[PDB]
Amino acid sequence: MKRTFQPSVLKRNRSHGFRARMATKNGRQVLARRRAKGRARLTVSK
Amino acid sequence: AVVKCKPTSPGRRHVVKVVNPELHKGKPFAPLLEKNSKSGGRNNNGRITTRHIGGGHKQAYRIVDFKRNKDGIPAVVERLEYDPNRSANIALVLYKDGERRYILAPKGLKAGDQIQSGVDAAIKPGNTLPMRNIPVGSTVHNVEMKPGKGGQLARSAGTYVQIVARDGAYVTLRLRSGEMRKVEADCRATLGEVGNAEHMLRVLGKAGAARWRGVRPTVRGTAMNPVDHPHGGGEGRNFGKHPVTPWGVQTKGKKTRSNKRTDKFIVRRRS
RNA sequence: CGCGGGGUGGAGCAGCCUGGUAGCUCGUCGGGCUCAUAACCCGAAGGUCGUCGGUUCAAAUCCGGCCCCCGCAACCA
RNA sequence: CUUUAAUGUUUGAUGUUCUAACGUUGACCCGUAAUCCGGGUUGCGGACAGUGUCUGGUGGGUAGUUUGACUGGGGCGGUC
RNA sequence: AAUUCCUUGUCGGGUAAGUUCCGACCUGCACGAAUGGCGUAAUGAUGGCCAGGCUGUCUCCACCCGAGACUCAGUGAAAUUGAACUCGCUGUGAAGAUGCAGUGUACCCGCGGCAAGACGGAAAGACCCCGUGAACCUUUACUAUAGCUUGACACUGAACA
RNA sequence: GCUCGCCGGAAGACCAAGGGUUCCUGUCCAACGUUAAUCGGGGCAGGGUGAGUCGACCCCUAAGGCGAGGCCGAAAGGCGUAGUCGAUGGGAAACAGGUUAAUAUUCCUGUACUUGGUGUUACUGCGAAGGGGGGACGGAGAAGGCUAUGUUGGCCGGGCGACGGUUGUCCCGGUUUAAGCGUGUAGGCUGGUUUUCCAGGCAAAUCCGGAAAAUCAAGGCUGAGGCGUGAUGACGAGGCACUACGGUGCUGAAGCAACAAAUGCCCUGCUUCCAGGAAAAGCCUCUAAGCAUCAGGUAACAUCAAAUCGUACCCCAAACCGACACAGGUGGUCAGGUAGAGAAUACCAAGGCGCUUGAGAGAACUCGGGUGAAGGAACUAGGCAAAAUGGUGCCGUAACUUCGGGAGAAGGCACGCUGAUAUGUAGGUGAGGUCCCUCGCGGAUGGAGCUGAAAUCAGUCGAAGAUACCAGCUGGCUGCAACUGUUUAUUAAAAACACAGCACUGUGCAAACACGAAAGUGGACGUAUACGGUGUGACGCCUGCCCGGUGCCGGAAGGUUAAU
RNA sequence: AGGACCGAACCGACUAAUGUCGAAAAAUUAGCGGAUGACUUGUGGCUGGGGGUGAAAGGCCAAUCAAACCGGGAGAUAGCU
């Protein structure tokens, strides 16, 4: 069937990426929380 | 002309093309063009402002000069040009100076006739001049409200304004709707009824005839659910509610006129 | 199984509601106008107010039995 | 006291005119190559319109709830 | 009649047999002229009926060729499950008994099969009812409110009829 | 390794995407593989990705995003100008051959091309965020000429063959060559050139546009492919030579003609129709503020530079997505032979595989199917399932109708092969020879060769000739919907929804309406033959009576009536 | 010319069997319907929780929709089991 996840990096990084997050007020709220739990993969990258 | 197409298939059974055998079948004059990426009927924040929009063929917005800001300069009509962005068809007219412009081709104006803009423009359809210079009882179009915008009233095909009177600084114009509004006498208007007045005779037949226009399918209210529409709902297929809009407005009878800063200008109400 | 209203000259309605006096159009009988009828004009009669009991200075009126009519009801898996 | 009459004086409701308030998604110019905008001229309206406060009406477009019980199952019916 | 309760209405046709169907009679419980009425060529993976054709759908199935089932070697789950030495019948009993009483019967243990029961297994019944539960939706249920609209005041001034 | 069998418009060969060493090599077997496993996409270790011409980064834009001031909003923040980003877009330039255990349009040999910097010589005026041209474009249809490619033949090389014929009209294999350059055809487009003048292109202008004159009839632009060159080069079958027995080294004949022919190219064409068919930069060119012993530009030449990143492998699947080595989903290019209209399909080529459990048994029963006496829907909710009809040309073809259809209606005749008309016809293409010439890729003419339907007649084979794969059941009545289409993805695909048409009604533009506390936008850069709301739903005949109630609209004299 | 006729790649999903702890958290097999159009589709954007979108089913918004998911109100309340 047509499964709901056909990956495409370009779409992904521009909708979940670092700059795609830092560009908003609520964005730094996320970077705050990801470091709050000390996680490593805060945003998708290489 | 109003071509009654021969019934070949149920679809070509009810289609009538408005084909004028004088149209330039070749590609038009480039320098007066401009693209126009359709909006899909959305506001700056993205939500749909009105339905039945979005789609159709790509259209090129040709920069038509309605303004007619040239004075005392003769011209020659080279060819009747077709434009998708209008019910009527514009005309590529060339002046003596070397400027080619697009206008609203009037009724009796073929490719080869002469026009002129200015206050000295004698009587002949297509000429732009002040209304106090224009003899009362005639027919005009492309009229403004204030000198300097271009022309709003009587713009689409087959539309005409009949100048009733010229009471002082205000002129009396009997519009197409029967609604009369006074306009400053310094206003400029172009003479003659707009040509290509056969568009109301156009019958489509094809459902796609509106689809390649850009118009989306128009649904009815007696089908939906109450959560998305004031109408809708029913097991025995009820209607039962007073005819309203998707926003509770008492339609099919309710004049929504409310501006007041311009209510000093409606002479006679639209009969 | 239930509920609401009604039952008034030959036909159909008033009066009841807030208790004495019973009205109207047509119709029945008759006279008259026309040669005849109809139509029209005029007068009188015609009502145990479905029925009995109770109670009240009056029973058509207030109330309780019996009979008749209209609408909905014969339901949910 | 009633009916009336000229005036001084104190306010209100209409008509018309006007321009400074204001509006201007009119022309034009400059900032500036720039359809935003601001300002400057001029034209067109005009103490309107518009916004704020308070207020009457409308108002399921929007929102928060109600929508009884006994019942030889419930409902109808009936009753408290 | 996608509408007619009664009803398989009545009549005629189609079959030897027609609660369906086709054409009509009007007694329309309760069609109706834009929540359009009556027809309508063409179109239709549409609903219903009939005929021809063609066939195992059927009278009644028969044989054969492959893939599993059966066997061997290897690998090796699953729902479920209080405890079990776990028979039928009659009756009684939280009201249909494998287990209680009476009684008949039955060597112990597997395989291949078929499915009546163990009110078998899966889903804390989606049905009826209840909770002074919830959820949206409706409106001439109550009260508010967006928005629209009216007026007073403010921004708002100058003069005369 | 020899056979068998499978797909072969794919289960093949290559790319984008997305993964991330799964590629290749050696070694190893507990764990992964639904089995065994010295095998592998498993563990350990080593190697491998070589670019001025490929893609991207880069230049410049679309939808749209963000966005100095600005406008606005409790704050957050929203919108948006100038700008700045963003391809699936446009914009410069390379192919063949050989080689590796694994990578090569990148490496090596050979043959070419592109944009810039400095310098040299000879000339000449150059110069913008400004202007013009170009870039630059739609669907469908048909035609002409070729190419990729295939077939036959000729020639060369080998064989003449384990059971009958086989030196002959026999058999098999090969017969391959690009980029660029020169020429610049078939074809298409368009009248060039010279002079003057001008409220035009926010200014200027020799560039463009316009109006009158002038001379002559072509010039110019563009353009697949062929032909030469590229190339006395490479490659190339088969021999010749050593085996770690996997392969390497050496050498090298023929290398063309004809026909058929694409969905490839000319074509970013032409005719025509309508729904009317991006933008900027690169590039060519004109000049402003200006600068002229200059700076720069044009042309020829020498030389230097062309960075960075990706580059392995998989890429219609055991490596992507589906928890799995999953009968599923996944864009684009190339795509041979015979029959066949065809990319259907059947059998084969190139190439890759037999699907990672099998050996016996042949019971019931289940599933996928074949066939079946006589009857032929008696089955059943119902002709559901199976069966049957199924191809080409011609003949013939009703009711009804909006005169298009209905209709491929129904129902029928002939279909193989061989010979003959004719040592394979009509037709197609077409060398040589000949003539002419404003000499080239020429025009007429001429006919060898090659290729190749169909119709008729005669004869013959079988029960059957569309003999297989492939491939319509038909007629009639009638309800509804007009029709194609759309929808409950994952139980309802229709009578529901839409539909064009019609009717009513709102809107005179800072339009209503709609999102948004506002600004700002869509509506529309449209303005009444228009736009939004609602109702019904092609076409034909028509669409009655009721203004009580509700709602709406118009008029407000009067009653009542909030704040002030 | 055709929302024209037959029928492949492509797209969809009417009928029936197989399957239902399956090959698979809606598929295969054999017939089907459209297939130059209201067409299909790759890539890259815009519109969002009382809102989006809708050829209008109360379908869809990551296998989850008469109001998605995550965390915080909140150890909500529970005359109930």
Angstrom distance, B97 CA to F197 C1': 12
Q: Radius of gyration (Cα) for chain B, nearest Å?
A: 22
Sequence letter at residue B114: Q
> Is the distance between the Cβ of B271 and the closest atom of strand E smaller than 7 Å?
no
DSSP secondary structure, B127-149, as one string: -EEETTTSPTT-EEESB-SSSSS
Annotate B169-219 with DSSP letters as a single string: TEEEEE-TTS-EEEEETT-EEEES-BS-TTGGG-----SHHHHTTTPPP--
CB B111 within 8 A of CB B129: no
Same-domain check for residues B249 and B205: yes
How many distinct structural domains can be found in chain B? 3
Residues B126, B180 share a domain = yes
d(CA B26, C1' F265) / Å = 26
Task: Tell me whether residue B91 is exposed, middle or buried, using C-beta atoms within 10 angstroms of its C-beta: 0 to 12, 13 to 18, 19 or more.
Answer: buried
**Nucleotide with C1' nearest the B181 CA:** F508
| CATH code at position B43 | 2.40.50.140
Resolution of the experimental model in angstroms, please? 4.0
The arrangement of strands across the sheet holding B114-117 comes to B100-104, B90-95, B73-80, B114-117, B128-130, B188-191, B139-141, B161-165, B170-174, B180-184
B251 touches strand E (CB under 7 A): no
Q: What determination technique applies here?
A: cryo-EM
| Integer Cα distance of B201 and B263 in angstroms | 35
Question: Which CA distances in Å does A5 have to A1, A9, A44, B243?
Answer: 11, 12, 16, 46
B146 and B209 part of one domain: no
Distance from CA(A1) to C1'(F339), angstroms, rounded: 39
What range defines the domain where residue B182 resides?
Answer: 117-194
B51 touches strand G (CB under 7 A): yes
Query: What secondary structure does DSSP assign to B47-100, as a single string?
Result: -BSSSS-S-SS--B------S----SEEEEEEEE---TTSSS-EEEEEESSS-E
Residue B184's DSSP bridge partners are B170
B106 with B37, same domain: the answer is: yes
Please tell me whether residues B97 and B5 are part of one structural domain: yes
- CB B114 within 8 Å of CB B76: yes
Fold of A1-46: Helix Hairpins (1.10.287)
Return the structure tokens found at B199: 């568009």
